[PDB]
């Protein structure tokens, strides 16, 4: 009765997935852009970095 | 993880002698190798230097010509061949490990020597500083030239001596602590002048602290601060 | 530069020169990939010729690495890929199992299943160059017990006499005629375990794989 | 009739998990990036080329300070590289020449390999011998390892082609936990910030979110039609991008249980070898094996640059902690650090 | 003044050496030694075509040509060790095919496979210049306008080491492949082997007679300008260095439309 066994652990495992906490796809996509406005800044590679401060050019 | 050296002793003027130092524990032909010299009035003297092959050879400028060092991989054993000794050769030769990579810890290991008897300038401020235990000092010590290389590294070592003992590493480039010392030490400074801080002192720290200059060859040592209780 | 960077510098050469020397070491070498059905008598030709298994030796003057990859029971497109510059795949297969069938089989037998390897592996993306070194092992039983049954339950098609050179030569055939690269070669051989004699067939084998290889590069063809 | 009754159960199950899905999805996200400016034309160039290896590169990671780099070898080697100044700070040799993973400890003590041996090889190299000696051998795996991440100097979570994943203990060598519910090869692995969850994407066309300390698959993600060979984490842990044979890179976000973003384009048909993101996640850089690398807007999906500097497939990426360089690992034996 | 219409070869030999040139430059699946011989050939005959072929030209078109002495000395200097390095990169191929047919194991390497082809293009080029830098001085003893190198003692010299032991070296180094392709199908002996066998004793055979063909009736004239009285007219001499000339233009085609890689560089560059 492996296959007993196999069902039976699938049916927990969807079981536990099916009942987790969501949000709204607006949420995340104004989370990532608020977190990538945040640190646009700080990026060298978004911003090229002048050769007196890259380490790999000067 | 041990040196051992061999060879010294006394030898009449213009002989000749051979300082040997055997290898145990660690990877020998990975390892450059240096003799350091220190007299009883004059402090520590670095002597020469050999690279991790057969390649870079150096020598001081008192001793240049005169000496001459050998390796032998196969064995883990280095030689140093000395020829028309006088009277200035008379002191203690410590053999020293120093690997060279980026992040690494160069003369961190020190055998026990040898006695023999027959252009950067380091200064200390003060030969002695009057101490108790349980406070914290400060040791001073300045340059002729700035340390501080283009690429950020400032290359000043401390290094201390207890009575009886050879030189451990304690701090390299100025800010760095050595494997197996306590946080108790700590070292800061710019340019040419830097500062070695011990913020609690105990029993241990009583001896000789030696300030060194690995810019460029020759390396010089400074007087020495002698911490007494 | 510093002198830490110099002893940095020289420590970087001489870590190149120790790889320049291994990789130099490396070049005399002729390495193969063996597969099978796994029942093929794969340990056999292994005990013959002496995870992931490596067997040395040195035939004449040249230095043989057998890679056995049977312990490695998941997907080949994930792994195979690494065995691109291997020089050639000796591939095993078992005559004796014309008609030999396993019980999670399912009405297969070992035909129609060896020889889907061997087409997927002829077929293969990174094999397109890569010569094959077929042994027809097991010839001794597969001819007795054809004297029953030649070749009727696996090839229904075949059509011919009772014997061992027709059938195997059929089978060869079919084996063959999976090859659709111009620059791609067969070695074929009957084996059994009395006849140890297999190590110069593959060293002839690499032999010629070499020299055609050389002259494809020479463009003398 | 039971098993009927079981699988009629986990149908109904998918069922409620798809819908549950359908009603998070209130928008999409190149329609809320729609009012956000594009970043242009990013044209990077070569700095350095890393030569020295013999044959295939097939893994590469960063250290913590971004100047070390550690690359693996089919000719048996790993080597530790000087970023800045080209050196070679160290040549390890290898038992096994089959390497397939490699891995930086964040410390900078440690360095792991492993591969088609079912071996776990952790290389110890701060020593005081000098030398950089075989540290641990972790064994129990049944099949080849295909990646290896460390969580601190004495975790390490490995994933393998046994269609599981295991984290082990370096001082005691035994695995403390092992994480099972994938049908086929698991083939990347990419932790999270804070080292408490983790993602392993598998040859089943999905990815799972597993969590470290409880030992249980929290989610699964699918989506892909072929096999997923590359898994990377978005700095803030909320989100991550997998990408696949399909010749499509595929963004999703753990809290919404949904796909966010697909990245593909007609005249891409080579699959992706390895996906890394850009410090502040504006740009996702994606080598294929067309011989390149591409870098998209990882908002809006669009190719905003492309490095074209290698001759064979790109095998590994690489960014530092810092952004400030980029590095790639092609079969061409070559390494190339662009900015 | 009718003999410019012999430019156009000129406008061949540079175009068929250039694209060879580029299907090394432009494909990197064409590195091999054997391929970087073939690149020391086109640089060789794209030489003789520019620096070489227009002069020739000048001096055929009119029967004065008033530049200096020293000039036209360099002219033929150059001349000779263009030619001369044309020849010994054929006979560095063929060397290099019996390398990689009698000794397989060493030519499919990594290390030696790179010494070797450096090796013999240095030696070819050094040997073209010790035999051509004789003519800088002395012996080419220029009567007025006319500079033909006529001094027996580096005529015979430079006709035995240009060319005939060249040629020797080649006949024998084919004569050895042949046999050993003849012998190694004897002992394996499926229509495509006996369609390989029979392209490569027709690529041998086609190399030696195009090489044949194209220079030894010139050096057979050399010889026997100086070492005997027979009537040669002026125009055969030119002639039988215009063949020279034409294999020099020639030698990329069957050098390199048989190898289908060069082919795709071919047409993917075109
Ligand atoms: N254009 C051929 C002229 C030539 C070439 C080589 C020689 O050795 C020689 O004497 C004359």
Redesign the interface.
């Known amino acids: 009765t492996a296959?007993?066994a196999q069902?039976?652990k699938?049916?927990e495992?969807?079981?536990?997935?099916?009942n987790?906490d969501?949000?709204?796809?607006?949420?995340?996509?104004?989370?990532?852009?608020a977190?990538?406005?945040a640190?646009?800044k700080?990026?060298?590679?978004?911003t090229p970095?002048p050769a007196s401060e890259?380490?790999?050019?000067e | 993880?041990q040196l051992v050296e061999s060879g010294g002793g006394l030898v009449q003027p213009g002989g000749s002698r051979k300082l040997s130092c055997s290898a145990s524990?660690?990877?020998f032909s990975?390892?450059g190798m240096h003799w350091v010299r220190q007299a009883p009035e004059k402090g520590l003297e670095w002597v020469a230097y050999i690279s991790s092959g057969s390649g870079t050879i150096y020598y001081a400028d008192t001793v240049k010509g005169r000496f001459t060092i050998s390796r032998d991989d196969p064995k883990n054993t280095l030689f140093l061949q000395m020829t028309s000794l006088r009277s200035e050769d008379t002191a203690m030769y410590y053999c020293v490990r120093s690997?060279y990579?980026?992040?690494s810890s160069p003369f961190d290991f020190w055998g026990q020597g040898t006695t023999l008897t027959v252009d950067i300038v380091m200064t200390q401020a003060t030969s002695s500083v009057p101490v108790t235990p349980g406070e914290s000092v400060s040791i001073s010590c300045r340059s002729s030239k700035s340390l501080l290389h283009s690429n950020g590294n400032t290359y000043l070592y401390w290094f201390l001596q207890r009575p009886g003992q050879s030189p451990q590493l304690l701090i390299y480039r100025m800010s760095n602590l050595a494997?197996g010392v306590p946080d108790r030490f700590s070292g800061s400074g710019s340019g040419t002048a830097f500062t070695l801080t011990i913020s609690r002192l105990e029993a241990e720290d009583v001896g000789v602290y030696y300030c060194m200059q690995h810019l460029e060859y020759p390396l010089t040592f400074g007087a020495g601060t002698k911490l007494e209780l | 530069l510093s002198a830490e960077?110099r002893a940095?510098?020289e420590?970087?050469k001489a870590?190149?020169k120790?790889?320049k020397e291994?990789?130099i070491s490396?070049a005399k070498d002729v390495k193969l990939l063996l597969l099978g059905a796994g029942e093929s008598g794969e340990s056999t030709i292994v005990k013959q010729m002496k995870?992931?298994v490596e067997t040395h030796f040195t035939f004449k003057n040249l230095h043989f690495r057998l890679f056995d990859?049977g312990?490695?029971?998941?997907?080949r497109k994930?792994?195979i890929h690494?065995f691109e510059?291997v020089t050639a795949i000796i591939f095993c297969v078992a005559l004796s199992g014309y008609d030999q069938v396993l019980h999670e089989d399912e009405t297969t037998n070992r035909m129609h299943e060896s020889l889907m390897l061997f087409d997927s592996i002829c077929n293969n993306k990174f094999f397109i160059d890569t010569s094959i070194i077929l042994f027809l092992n097991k010839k001794d039983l597969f001819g007795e017990k054809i004297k029953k049954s030649p070749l009727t339950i696996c090839f229904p098609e075949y059509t011919g006499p009772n014997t061992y050179e027709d059938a195997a030569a059929y089978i060869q055939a079919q084996f063959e005629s999976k090859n659709r690269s111009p620059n791609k070669e067969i070695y074929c051989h009957m084996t059994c375990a009395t006849d140890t004699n297999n190590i110069q067939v593959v060293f002839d084998a690499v032999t010629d794989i070499i020299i055609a290889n050389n002259l494809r590069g020479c463009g003398l063809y | 009739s039971?098993?009927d009754q079981?699988?009629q159960?986990?149908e109904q199950?998918?069922n409620?998990?798809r819908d549950?899905?359908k009603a998070?999805?209130?928008?999409?996200?190149s329609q809320?990036?729609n009012n956000?400016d594009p970043?242009g034309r990013?044209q990077?160039r070569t700095?350095?080329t890393l030569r020295?290896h013999?044959?295939?590169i097939?893994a590469m990671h960063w250290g913590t300070d971004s100047?070390?780099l550690v690359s693996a070898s089919?000719?048996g080697?790993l080597?530790i590289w000087?970023?800045?100044?080209?050196?070679?700070?160290?040549?390890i040799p290898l038992r096994?020449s089959?390497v397939?993973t490699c891995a930086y400890a964040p410390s900078?003590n440690y360095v792991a390999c492993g591969g088609?041996?079912?071996?776990c090889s952790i290389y110890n190299l701060?020593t005081?011998?000098?030398?950089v000696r075989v540290s641990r051998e972790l064994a129990g795996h049944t099949?080849?390892l295909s990646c290896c991440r460390f969580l601190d100097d004495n975790q390490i979570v490995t994933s393998s082609?046994?269609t599981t994943c295991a984290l082990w203990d370096i001082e005691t060598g035994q695995q403390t936990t092992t994480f099972t519910?994938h049908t086929?090869?698991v083939?990347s692995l990419s932790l999270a910030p804070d080292t408490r969850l983790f993602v392993s994407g598998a040859?089943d066309a999905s990815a799972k979110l597993w969590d470290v300390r409880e030992g249980?698959?929290?989610?699964?993600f699918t989506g892909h039609e072929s096999?997923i060979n590359a898994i990377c984490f978005?700095?803030?842990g909320?989100?991550f991008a997998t990408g696949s044979d399909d010749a499509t890179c595929r963004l999703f976000?753990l809290?919404?249980?949904?796909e966010?973003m697909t990245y593909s384009h007609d005249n891409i048909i080579c699959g992706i070898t390895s996906v890394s993101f850009?410090?502040?996640?504006?740009?996702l850089l994606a080598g294929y094996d067309d011989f390149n690398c591409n870098v998209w807007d990882?908002?809006k999906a669009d190719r905003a640059g492309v490095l074209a500097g290698h001759?064979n497939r790109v095998s590994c990426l690489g960014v530092t902690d810092?952004?400030?360089?980029?590095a790639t690992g092609s079969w061409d034996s070559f390494l190339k650090?662009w900015? | 003044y009718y003999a410019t219409l012999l430019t156009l070869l000129i406008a061949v030999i540079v175009f068929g050496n250039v694209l060879v040139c580029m299907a090394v430059s432009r494909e990197?699946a064409l590195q091999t030694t054997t391929n970087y011989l073939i690149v020391s050939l086109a640089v060789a005959d794209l030489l003789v075509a520019t620096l070489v072929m227009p002069w020739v030209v000048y001096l055929e078109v009119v029967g004065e040509w008033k530049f200096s002495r020293i000039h036209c000395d360099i002219f033929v200097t150059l001349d000779v060790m263009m030619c001369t390095a044309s020849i010994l990169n054929l006979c560095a191929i063929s060397i290099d095919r019996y390398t990689a047919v009698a000794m397989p194991m060493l030519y499919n390497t990594r290390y030696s496979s790179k010494r070797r082809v450096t090796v013999m293009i240095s030696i070819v080029w050094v040997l073209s210049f010790t035999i051509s830098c004789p003519l800088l001085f002395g012996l080419n003893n220029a009567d007025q306008n006319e500079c033909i190198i006529a001094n027996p003692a580096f005529v015979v010299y430079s006709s035995i080491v240009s060319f005939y032991v060249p040629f020797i070296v080649t006949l024998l180094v084919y004569i050895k492949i042949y046999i050993v392709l003849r012998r190694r199908r004897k002992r394996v002996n499926r229509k495509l082997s006996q369609q390989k066998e029979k392209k490569a004793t027709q690529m041998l055979a086609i190399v030696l007679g195009v090489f044949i063909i194209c220079w030894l009736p010139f050096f057979i004239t050399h010889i026997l300008n100086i070492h005997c009285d027979c009537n040669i007219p002026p125009v055969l001499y030119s002639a039988f260095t215009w063949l020279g000339y034409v294999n020099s233009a020639v030698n990329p085609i069957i050098y390199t439309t048989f190898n289908i890689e060069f082919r795709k560089a071919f047409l993917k560059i075109l």
């Open positions: 296959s007993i069902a039976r699938l049916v495992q969807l079981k536990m997935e099916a987790i969501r949000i709204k796809v607006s949420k995340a996509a104004a989370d990532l852009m977190y990538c406005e640190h646009a700080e990026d060298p590679l978004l970095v890259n380490p790999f050019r | 993880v524990g660690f990877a990975s390892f690997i990579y980026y992040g494997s | 960077e940095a510098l420590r970087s870590i190149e120790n790889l291994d990789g490396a995870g992931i990859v312990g490695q029971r998941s997907e994930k792994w690494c510059d | 039971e098993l079981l699988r159960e986990a199950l998918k409620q998990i549950a899905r998070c999805a209130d928008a999409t996200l809320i990036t956000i970043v990013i990077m700095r350095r020295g013999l044959a295939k097939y100047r070390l089919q000719d080697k080597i000087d970023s800045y100044t080209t050196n070679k700070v160290h040549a096994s089959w397939m900078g088609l041996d079912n071996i701060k005081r011998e000098g030398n099949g080849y082609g046994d519910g086929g090869d083939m040859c249980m698959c929290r989610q699964t096999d978005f700095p803030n909320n989100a976000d809290r919404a249980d949904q966010l850009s410090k502040s996640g504006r740009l990882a908002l001759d810092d952004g400030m360089a980029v650090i900015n | 990197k």
